[PDB]
């Protein structure tokens, strides 16, 4: 038997050495450091967090944050 795990075809031509250890992810980065910053999204509930004066509102997706930090 077999299944369809193809997924999205969204990608950008760029240099990427440090490969993500986590399986399936399939995400590599050039900046040896980037990786470290990436894993963050894997560990924990939400990597991004507003942390404003009196907001205390976090988010999982990036765009979500930026879109939320617009009304502030
Ligand atoms: Zn990953
Ligand atoms: Zn906020």
From Swiss-Prot:
Gene: KLF10
Disulfide pattern: none
Residues in C2H2-type zinc fingers: 18-42, 48-72
Tree of life domain: Eukaryota
Subcellular location, record wording: Nucleus
Post-translational modifications reported in the UniProt record: Ubiquitinated; mediated by SIAH1 and leading to its subsequent proteasomal degradation.
Name of the protein in question: Krueppel-like factor 10
Induction details: By TGFB1 and BMP2.
Residue ranges crossing the lipid bilayer per the database entry: none
Organism: Homo sapiens
Function: Transcriptional repressor which binds to the consensus sequence 5'-GGTGTG-3'. Plays a role in the regulation of the circadian clock; binds to the GC box sequence in the promoter of the core clock component ARTNL/BMAL1 and represses its transcriptional activity. Regulates the circadian expression of genes involved in lipogenesis, gluconeogenesis, and glycolysis in the liver. Represses the expression of PCK2, a rate-limiting step enzyme of gluconeogenesis. May play a role in the cell cycle regulation.
Family recorded in the similarity comment: Belongs to the Sp1 C2H2-type zinc-finger protein family.
């Amino acid at each position: 038997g077999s299944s369809g795990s193809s997924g999205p075809q969204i990608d950008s031509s760029r240099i990427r050495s440090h490969i993500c250890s986590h399986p399936g992810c399939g995400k590599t980065y050039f900046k040896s450091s980037h990786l470290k910053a990436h894993t963050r999204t894997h560990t924990g509930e939400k990597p991004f967090s507003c942390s404003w004066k009196g907001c205390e509102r976090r988010f999982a997706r990036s765009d979500e944050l930026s879109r939320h930090r617009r009304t502030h």
